[PDB]
Design an enzyme around this catalytic site. Structure first.
Site, mmCIF file in Angstrom:
data_model
loop_
_atom_site.group_PDB
_atom_site.id
_atom_site.type_symbol
_atom_site.label_atom_id
_atom_site.label_comp_id
_atom_site.label_asym_id
_atom_site.label_seq_id
_atom_site.Cartn_x
_atom_site.Cartn_y
_atom_site.Cartn_z
ATOM 1 N N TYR A 85 0.978 -1.183 0.060
ATOM 2 C CA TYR A 85 -0.140 -0.191 -0.003
ATOM 3 C C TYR A 85 0.551 1.054 -0.175
ATOM 4 O O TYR A 85 1.765 1.289 0.547
ATOM 5 C CB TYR A 85 -1.108 0.363 1.436
ATOM 6 C CG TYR A 85 -0.312 -0.206 2.552
ATOM 7 C CD1 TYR A 85 0.465 0.811 3.162
ATOM 8 C CD2 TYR A 85 -0.108 -1.677 2.548
ATOM 9 C CE1 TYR A 85 1.005 0.518 4.272
ATOM 10 C CE2 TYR A 85 0.702 -1.722 4.545
ATOM 11 C CZ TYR A 85 0.739 -0.062 4.972
ATOM 12 O OH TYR A 85 1.617 -0.337 5.892
ATOM 13 N N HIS A 141 -1.592 -2.794 10.020
ATOM 14 C CA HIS A 141 -0.836 -3.477 9.725
ATOM 15 C C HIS A 141 0.982 -2.908 10.709
ATOM 16 O O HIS A 141 1.868 -2.949 10.647
ATOM 17 C CB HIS A 141 -0.026 -2.692 8.457
ATOM 18 C CG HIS A 141 -0.433 -2.851 7.428
ATOM 19 N ND1 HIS A 141 -1.926 -2.433 6.725
ATOM 20 C CD2 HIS A 141 -0.180 -4.791 6.137
ATOM 21 C CE1 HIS A 141 -1.930 -3.054 5.968
ATOM 22 N NE2 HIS A 141 -1.338 -4.225 5.090
ATOM 23 N N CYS A 177 -0.314 0.021 12.806
ATOM 24 C CA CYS A 177 -0.695 1.442 13.736
ATOM 25 C C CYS A 177 -2.004 1.482 14.604
ATOM 26 O O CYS A 177 -2.774 0.525 14.305
ATOM 27 C CB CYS A 177 -1.359 2.958 11.810
ATOM 28 S SG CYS A 177 0.481 3.006 11.374
ATOM 29 N N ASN A 231 -5.481 2.536 14.167
ATOM 30 C CA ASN A 231 -6.551 3.518 13.589
ATOM 31 C C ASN A 231 -7.844 3.183 13.701
ATOM 32 O O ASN A 231 -8.546 2.614 15.063
ATOM 33 C CB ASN A 231 -6.865 1.505 12.559
ATOM 34 C CG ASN A 231 -6.127 1.641 11.062
ATOM 35 O OD1 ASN A 231 -5.461 2.276 11.601
ATOM 36 N ND2 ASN A 231 -6.858 0.897 10.229
ATOM 37 N N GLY A 261 8.071 4.087 12.974
ATOM 38 C CA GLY A 261 6.538 4.161 11.762
ATOM 39 C C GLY A 261 4.696 3.871 12.294
ATOM 40 O O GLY A 261 3.992 4.242 11.690
ATOM 41 N N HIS A 290 -3.787 7.678 13.439
ATOM 42 C CA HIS A 290 -4.356 8.237 12.080
ATOM 43 C C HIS A 290 -5.783 7.847 11.958
ATOM 44 O O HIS A 290 -6.712 7.068 12.321
ATOM 45 C CB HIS A 290 -3.110 8.413 11.249
ATOM 46 C CG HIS A 290 -3.606 6.807 10.525
ATOM 47 N ND1 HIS A 290 -4.351 6.234 9.456
ATOM 48 C CD2 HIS A 290 -2.550 5.483 10.601
ATOM 49 C CE1 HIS A 290 -3.851 4.770 9.655
ATOM 50 N NE2 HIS A 290 -3.261 4.632 10.071
#
Length: 217
Positions: free
Chosen positions: A156, A190, A192, A194, A170, A174
């Site tokens: 992605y 992956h 993060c 969400n 990373g 968000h």
């Protein structure tokens, strides 16, 4: 040969989160790091109750083992330069992987328990006590960061809104419209954290650089 203190963060008169570390930049790259570390004096604080790191050759970083007290003035002096900064409210975000929730509280008062989706088992969200490192209204999440080529069906490369950097690796909090249907039920990201666009926008506007973020089971 001694070395001069160029810059100190947080700047004098700044207002930061209760987990904001102290960084000191020296004029010249430091040779005797152990001496530079001993030159850090923090009022009502023992620097052994923390951890020293060296992000760049010339910058020194100290992170406290506990949070700063909120709504406080922290006074320090590194070598010559004497400065001070202020802390704002304690704004704690707790990502709970098993419960699929992101709970935010201010000074011990729980404001929102939001549906969240953490990392899938292949790419789990790293657990621990972190700090909001940055705030970016837009940032591009690139799957090559975690070793997935754009040619792979699971690769992605997309722009996300209202991103709060959790790790330098990373991990972000968000806006993820793509996974609204999974937030609160299962972890499909992956790595993060969400959130829905409204929850991510809400958290973005109220969070500050230095606010603590805890990821736990």
């Amino acid at each position: 040969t001694p070395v001069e203190v160029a810059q100190v963060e947080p700047a004098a008169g700044a207002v930061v989160g209760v987990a904001h570390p102290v960084t000191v930049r020296f004029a010249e790259p430091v040779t005797d790091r152990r001496s530079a570390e001993r030159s850090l004096r923090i009022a009502s604080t023992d620097t052994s109750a923390g951890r020293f790191r060296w992000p760049e050759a010339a910058v020194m970083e100290w992170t406290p083992d506990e949070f700063w007290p909120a709504h406080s003035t922290i006074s320090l002096s590194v070598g010559g330069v004497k400065t001070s900064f202020n802390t704002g409210a304690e704004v704690l975000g707790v990502a709970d992987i098993d419960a699929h929730t992101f709970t935010v509280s201010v000074d011990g008062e729980v404001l929102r328990k939001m549906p969240a989706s953490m990392g899938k088992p292949k790419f789990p969200t790293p657990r621990g006590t972190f700090t909001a490192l940055a705030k970016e209204p837009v940032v591009v999440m690139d799957s090559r960061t975690i070793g997935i080529p754009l040619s792979d069906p699971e690769g992605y490369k997309l722009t996300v809104n209202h991103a709060v950097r959790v790790t330098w690796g990373g991990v972000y909090v968000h806006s993820a419209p793509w996974s609204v249907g999974s937030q609160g039920y299962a972890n499909v990201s992956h790595g993060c954290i969400n959130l829905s666009p409204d929850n991510a926008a809400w958290y973005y506007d109220m969070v500050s650089v230095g606010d603590p973020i805890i990821v736990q089971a």
